[PDB]
């Protein structure tokens, strides 16, 4: 018997490739982040696999970070019985602007066009400064609770500052803008469904796991179908990519998380946010600008010791040293966490003595996730 997990589409393909999940680990089932969490924090496989209610839920991969009151509720009416969750990166990540709109002519977009197109300012094609192209731009969402919609809107909420009205941060992208969706905007379900979408009418573009904006890696290079950003005219200063290579360097510059701080789930996952302001790392001047992570919850504690053993060899393969997923992470068009990432991470989590440890047997001890199923 297995232990499951699920959740986010950004990382599915990464988490779905052979010998990534060690053994135990049922293949990863991608839902969305919002749909992830509810799985988790409710131990809810139908939003896994609707109507399969016959397996417990162990983990899920989430690109939106727990909400004050996912974590409250959990603390209260879980980890009493469950043990505390945890929440840790597990990569770092682009979010990539892939359109359908043909043309030799490189689309690069200037941080502000990226705001007028999202918001529905700029509306046509040749309102794209150099686009060549021309015609009605079609923006194409995420219907659900998306950690994509997250991140994205992260970065809309940090640098839009001049449209009628506001990006909040949101997990549902129809609402983030306060002045409303663009006219004639599509919803679509999934990373995978937005990209058939994307397709499905000339003209479209959106925002995407960099796994799924194009169908190779050098296609996130290609910018008649991924658009590049930070375009500034007056300085003559071109765009780039959402290549991994163009987020690895400010990926690897966030600060572990702090010390004092560790056992606060909310404390492991950094964000990128508004510029000088403390608690939120400031989007890089430099390489390519819309990036953020996708992370991991587990449970600390699980009834069953070899559900627990099996949680345990994955941290110890996905935060090694040696023996690790990393090479499967770049395959997958995302960064590696550096050393004293990983290392930190492996501190709390692995090391027997910590208080935060996997199936620390004084914390754990009669607790943890249920072994059977109950209704
Ligand atoms: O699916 P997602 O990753 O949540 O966007």
């Given at each position: 018997?297995?232990?499951?997990?699920?959740?986010?589409?950004?990382?599915?393909?990464?988490?779905?490739?052979?010998?990534?999940?060690?053994?135990?680990?049922?293949?990863?089932?991608?839902?969305?982040?919002?749909?992830?969490?509810?799985?988790?924090?409710?131990?809810?496989?139908?939003?896994?696999?609707?109507?399969?209610?016959?397996?417990?839920?162990?983990?899920?991969?989430?690109?939106?970070?727990?909400?004050?009151?996912?974590?409250?509720?959990?603390?209260?009416?879980?980890?009493?019985?469950?043990?505390?969750?945890?929440?840790?990166?597990?990569?770092?990540?682009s979010v990539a602007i892939?359109?359908?709109?043909?043309?030799?002519?490189?689309?690069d977009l200037s941080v502000?066009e990226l705001?007028?197109?999202?918001?529905?300012?700029?509306?046509?094609?040749?309102?794209?400064?150099?686009?060549?192209?021309?015609?009605?731009?079609?923006?194409?969402?995420?219907?659900?609770?998306?950690?994509?919609?997250?991140?994205?809107?992260?970065f809309?909420?940090?640098?839009?500052?001049?449209?009628?009205?506001?990006?909040?941060?949101?997990?549902?992208?129809?609402?983030?803008?306060?002045?409303?969706?663009?006219?004639?905007?599509?919803?679509?379900?999934?990373?995978?469904?937005?990209?058939?979408?994307?397709?499905?009418?000339?003209?479209?573009?959106?925002?995407?796991?960099?796994?799924?904006?194009?169908?190779?890696?050098?296609?996130?290079?290609?910018?008649?179908?991924?658009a590049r950003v930070g375009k500034?005219?007056?300085?003559?200063?071109?765009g780039v990519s959402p290549?991994?290579?163009?987020?690895?360097?400010?990926?690897?510059?966030?600060?572990?998380?702090?010390?004092?701080?560790?056992?606060?789930?909310?404390?492991?996952?950094?964000?990128?946010?508004?510029?000088?302001?403390?608690?939120?790392?400031?989007?890089?001047?430099?390489?390519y600008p819309i990036?953020?992570?996708?992370?991991?919850?587990?449970?600390?504690?699980?009834?069953?010791?070899?559900?627990?053993?099996?949680?345990?060899?994955?941290?110890?393969?996905?935060?090694?040293?040696?023996?690790?997923?990393?090479?499967?992470?770049?395959?997958?068009?995302?960064?590696?966490?550096?050393?004293?990432?990983?290392?930190?991470?492996?501190?709390?989590?692995?090391?027997?003595?910590?208080?935060?440890?996997?199936?620390?047997?004084?914390?754990?001890?009669?607790?943890?996730?249920?072994?059977?199923?109950?209704?």
């Amino acid at each position: 018997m297995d232990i499951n997990g699920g959740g986010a589409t950004l990382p599915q393909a990464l988490y779905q490739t052979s010998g990534v999940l060690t053994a135990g680990f049922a293949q990863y089932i991608g839902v969305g982040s919002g749909n992830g969490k509810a799985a988790f924090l409710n131990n809810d496989y139908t939003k896994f696999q609707a109507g399969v209610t016959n397996k417990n839920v162990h983990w899920a991969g989430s690109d939106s970070k727990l909400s004050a009151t996912e974590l409250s509720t959990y603390a209260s009416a879980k980890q009493p019985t469950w043990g505390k969750l945890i929440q840790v990166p597990s990569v770092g990540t682009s979010v990539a602007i892939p359109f359908n709109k043909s043309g030799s002519a490189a689309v690069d977009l200037s941080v502000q066009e990226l705001c007028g197109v999202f918001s529905g300012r700029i509306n046509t094609w040749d309102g794209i400064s150099g686009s060549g192209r021309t015609g009605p731009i079609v923006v194409v969402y995420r219907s659900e609770s998306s950690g994509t919609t997250e991140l994205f809107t992260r970065f809309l909420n940090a640098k839009c500052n001049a449209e009628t009205g506001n990006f909040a941060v949101t997990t549902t992208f129809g609402t983030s803008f306060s002045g409303g969706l663009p006219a004639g905007a599509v919803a679509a379900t999934g990373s995978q469904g937005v990209m058939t979408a994307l397709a499905a009418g000339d003209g479209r573009i959106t925002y995407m796991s960099p796994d799924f904006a194009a169908p190779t890696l050098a296609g996130l290079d290609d910018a008649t179908k991924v658009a590049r950003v930070g375009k500034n005219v007056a300085t003559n200063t071109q765009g780039v990519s959402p290549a991994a290579a163009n987020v690895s360097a400010a990926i690897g510059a966030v600060p572990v998380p702090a010390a004092a701080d560790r056992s606060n789930p909310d404390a492991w996952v950094p964000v990128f946010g508004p510029d000088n302001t403390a608690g939120v790392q400031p989007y890089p001047t430099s390489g390519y600008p819309i990036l953020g992570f996708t992370n991991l919850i587990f449970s600390q504690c699980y009834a069953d010791a070899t559900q627990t053993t099996q949680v345990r060899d994955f941290f110890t393969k996905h935060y090694g040293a040696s023996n690790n997923n990393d090479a499967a992470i770049t395959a997958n068009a995302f960064v590696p966490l550096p050393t004293a990432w990983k290392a930190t991470v492996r501190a709390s989590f692995l090391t027997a003595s910590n208080a935060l440890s996997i199936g620390n047997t004084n914390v754990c001890n009669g607790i943890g996730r249920p072994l059977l199923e109950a209704a």
